Design a protein around this nucleic acid. Structure first.
Lengths: 87, 745
RNA sequence: AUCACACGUUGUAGCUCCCUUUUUCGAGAAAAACGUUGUUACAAUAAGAGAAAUUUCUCGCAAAGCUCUGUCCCUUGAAAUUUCAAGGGACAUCUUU
DNA sequence: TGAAATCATATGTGTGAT
DNA sequence: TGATATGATTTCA
């Protein structure tokens, strides 16, 4: 459905990923790629604080980027899957 | 009937043997049924010695770095266009950067210097960084750009680094300060296009860097575990960390807090708990952490909140009342949790006390063919490939003869793992608890040498079959005839045929990394700069400027002769030609009539790997159409065949008068018949110039061809050229017959 | 496994060194093309694909495998030597990815 | 005078964190 | 530190 910052982890489950594996090659790969990338960018959205090279204000801006862009990446993967038969 | 036999097998870096051996009720081996060898690749880079996957890893890292660099350049261009600055940038951006400190910088110049700052960010290498930073603490050098125009291009003459020499490296913070000071002066100098929001965006671009995620993407998704069917518990929770701790009297519960990491003194690090401890003691909030230490559930919700949400508002709303304002604010400044444990929170609650006091989960809530060797548990690639080929041979032998009785290993953390896997994953038809028995080949091979077959191992692949045949003791004439001879039937079941692993992969390196020029390619030559450090006499005689400009050519001859052709020593000092210019690299022609048009057609690089060759016939002739990885990537099916004395522009093109015979991949069996001699071997390579095929003898006999390969043998006047195929056991050699030319995609 | 930095190479452009050619002014130089030393900047840094829609994401030199799709072999059987049924393999242009 | 062997020859690199 | 593409140069029918 509509992916937000909070409910990101409730759609980006491993069950949906394993359900996305029955698509044809020309469609599965672009969708599974947008799925893993959204998870990677989101699963490490707080890693900007583990390093002392970024100020708190700066790492805050990189956190918003690593969340808002990863939600968009997950939305496209779900939207394309909805256009497909996975829905 | 279902014959009982000992399998035997001989692991290797690039060759796995096998030898089916007759047995009886008393398990004393007898006359072997049939043997063979399964040769494959070395599973390592032959030159470097590293892993095959490491080259792909470095190439993918370079691709990602280039893509993200051009992506951040596009973002910078978008920002500059949005501020109506970009709307062919000046190339003297170092001098323009220094000029930005004093007097306003124009639109195009400011855009050029900002884009240069975005592309080159900075931070041997460290020595140069520290040296430039120390030299940056002086009034004269107000910035790295000023350090480059006033100090770098006076003593050296070049601003950028060259052939290493990292003494010119700068820092990310130093260039950040450059950008900040340039914005400050430009605003002081009345530059309209110096908004603070632009400064913030460009500083974010300069400082942004994708986190080192690594790991496995599977673990980062929120499962459900199907036990309690709610959700999946976070890996960095107290219960999950206790799960991996309890599994790995009562005095040991407090011990993980007794030390940050465990060592041999009192023997698993509780990384998340100690991380929270360090973050909490970082401030002066010691009072609140005392209460948090005792509570395990509060740590559980902290772990779930941080490993399931990532935005500040999300954790703030999820842990509103569970934590005070200062402890929460300090918690959301250094913590970063990810990944999940395989169990659930409620399941962890049920199972932890009983594990402390899979069995807890149970009490609260094929064989015929050897299965695939686990790829994740085995990390070393060469042993992985060896075990893979071993199991392929095992499956083939079981399919051909039935289930074996015992499997023994001669080796040739590896043998033990294979023995355990075969014992605990394969049916087998042994007697007792010795289903699999590995052994050392030294004493066994000495005892076999008492039978008189030692000093036989040569570069040919048939010697490897001895390591697997020796399974009988852990007669000599019989095995000698069966293995070494090429016709045991006419001398005394089948001759041993080395079944090289078919390398029918259609992907690989598109072209060589050294890119040359394609401006003058229609002459069949390419022009590439090479350093004087490795310029010999032949490359000097191949110089493009032999007759254009004679004076440099003669002086280079004299200097090379003065230092006796050693290019490194001859030009270790700056060469001075007429006019005072220095010479480090000079364009040198090279014969390039074949290659790949790369860099969007600007350059040309040599072909790197043949994936397929299409054999053809035309009026009693035989033709070879080479297909390369770049042609497969481009979806091109070539129809020009290899013909001597002519370049690819004019090749004899296969038309409707030409009948396709078969498509050949590397390491495929072929039969070649001609007036001179007929031979059966594996297609190793096609010479694009001479048109010959370098077919190699199956066993790579040194007496046959150059070190095993029948190089340069032609097919243009071959009576019959046919493609053969064989099983992975070197059995059932037959004639193949393709019907259609399969496309290369 | 992962992220960056510094090169290097190729194309373009500016300046720069030496220079072959075509002329002009008239030994020496102004102009034009090409080669090209050094230096800087930009573009690319596999060849390229897939799905959306001036641009974005993923894959793109490796390994393993048969869950899917293929090129063949091996067995088996039905219909007019051919098409097909089912099972088992070798591989991959297919899956992990 | 083309077809087949023969012998050569080049082939991207170094640094610093996660 | 080695397979791999391929070019010059001979030798053969």
């Amino acid at each position: 459905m509509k992916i937000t910052s909070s409910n990101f982890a409730t759609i980006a489950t491993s069950e949906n990923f394993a359900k996305l594996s029955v698509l044809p090659k020309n469609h599965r790969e672009p969708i599974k790629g947008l799925f893993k990338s959204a998870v990677e960018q989101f699963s490490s959205a707080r890693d900007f604080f583990k390093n002392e090279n970024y100020s708190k204000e700066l790492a805050e801006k990189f956190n918003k980027e690593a969340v808002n862009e990863a939600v968009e990446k997950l939305q496209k993967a779900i939207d394309l899957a909805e256009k497909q038969g996975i829905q | 009937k279902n014959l009982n036999y000992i399998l035997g097998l001989a692991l290797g870096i690039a060759s796995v043997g096998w030898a089916v051996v007759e047995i009886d009720e008393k398990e004393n081996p007898l006359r072997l049924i049939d043997v063979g060898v399964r040769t494959f690749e070395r599973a390592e880079v032959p030159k470097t010695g590293e892993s095959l996957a490491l080259s792909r890893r470095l190439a993918r890292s370079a691709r990602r770095l280039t893509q993200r660099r051009v992506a951040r350049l596009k973002k910078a261009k978008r920002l500059l266009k949005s501020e109506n600055i970009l709307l062919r940038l000046p190339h003297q951006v170092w001098q323009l950067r220094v000029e930005g400190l004093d007097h306003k910088l124009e639109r195009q110049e400011w855009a050029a210097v900002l884009l240069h700052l975005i592309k080159h960010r900075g931070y041997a290498l460290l020595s140069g960084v520290d040296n430039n930073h120390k030299l940056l603490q002086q009034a004269t050098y107000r910035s790295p750009a000023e350090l480059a125009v006033k100090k770098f291009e006076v003593e050296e003459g070049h601003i950028r680094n060259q052939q290493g020499a990292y003494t010119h490296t700068f820092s990310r913070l130093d260039l950040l300060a450059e950008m900040e000071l340039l914005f400050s002066r430009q605003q002081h100098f009345g530059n309209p296009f110096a908004s603070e929001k632009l400064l913030e965006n460009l500083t974010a671009l300069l400082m942004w860097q994708k986190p080192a995620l690594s790991g496995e993407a599977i673990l980062k998704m929120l499962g459900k575990c199907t036990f309690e069917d709610e959700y999946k518990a976070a890996k960095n929770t107290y219960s999950a960390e206790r799960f991996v701790w309890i599994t790995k009297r009562l005095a040991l519960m407090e011990q993980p807090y007794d030390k940050n990491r465990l060592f041999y003194s009192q023997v698993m690090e509780m990384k998340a708990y100690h991380q929270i401890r360090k973050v909490l003691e970082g401030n002066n909030l010691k009072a609140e952490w005392a209460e948090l230490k005792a509570n395990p559930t509060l740590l559980d919700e902290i772990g779930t909140a941080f490993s399931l949400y990532k935005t500040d508002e999300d954790i703030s709303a999820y842990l509103a009342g569970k934590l005070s304002q200062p402890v929460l604010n300090a918690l959301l400044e250094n913590l970063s949790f990810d990944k999940f444990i395989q169990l659930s929170l409620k399941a962890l609650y049920k199972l932890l006390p009983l594990m402390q006091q899979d069995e807890a989960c149970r009490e609260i809530y094929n064989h015929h063919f050897l299965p695939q060797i686990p790829a994740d548990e085995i990390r070393n690639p060469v042993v992985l490939r060896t075990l893979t080929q071993a199991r392929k041979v095992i499956n083939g032998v079981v399919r051909l003869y039935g289930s074996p009785a015992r499997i023994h290993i001669e080796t040739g953390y590896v043998a033990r793992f294979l023995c355990n896997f075969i014992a605990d994953n394969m049916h087998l038809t042994g007697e007792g608890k010795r289903k699999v028995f590995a052994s050392n080949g030294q004493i066994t091979a000495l005892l076999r040498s008492r039978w008189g077959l030692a000093k036989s191992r040569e570069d040919n692949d048939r010697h490897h079959a001895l390591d697997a045949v020796v399974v009988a003791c852990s007669f000599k004439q019989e095995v000698e005839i069966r293995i070494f001879s090429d016709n045991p039937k006419l001398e005394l079941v089948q001759p041993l045929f080395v079944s090289r692993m078919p390398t029918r992969k259609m992907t690989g390196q598109g072209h060589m990394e050294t890119v040359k020029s394609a401006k003058r390619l229609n002459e069949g030559i390419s022009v590439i700069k090479m350093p004087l450090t490795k310029l010999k006499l032949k490359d000097l005689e191949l110089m493009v400027n032999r007759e254009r400009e004679k004076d440099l050519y003669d002086t280079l001859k004299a200097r090379l002769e003065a230092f006796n052709d050693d290019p490194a020593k001859a030009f270790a000092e700056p060469f001075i030609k007429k006019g005072g210019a220095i010479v480090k690299s000079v364009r040198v022609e090279q014969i390039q009539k074949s290659g790949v048009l790369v860099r969007e057609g600007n350059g040309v690089a040599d072909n790197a790997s043949m994936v397929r060759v299409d054999v053809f016939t035309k009026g009693g002739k035989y033709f070879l159409v080479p297909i390369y990885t770049w042609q497969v990537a481009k979806g091109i099916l070539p129809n020009k065949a290899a013909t001597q004395y002519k370049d690819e522009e004019d090749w004899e093109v296969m038309d409707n008068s030409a009948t396709f015979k078969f498509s050949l991949h590397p390491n495929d069996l072929v039969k070649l018949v001609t007036k001179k001699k007929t031979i059966l071997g594996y297609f190793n390579g096609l010479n694009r110039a001479t048109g010959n095929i370098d077919i190699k003898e199956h066993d790579l006999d040194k007496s046959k061809g150059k070190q095993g390969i029948f190089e340069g043998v032609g097919i243009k006047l071959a009576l019959s050229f046919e493609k053969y195929q064989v099983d992975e056991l070197g059995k059932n050699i037959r004639l193949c017959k393709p019907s259609k030319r399969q496309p290369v995609r």
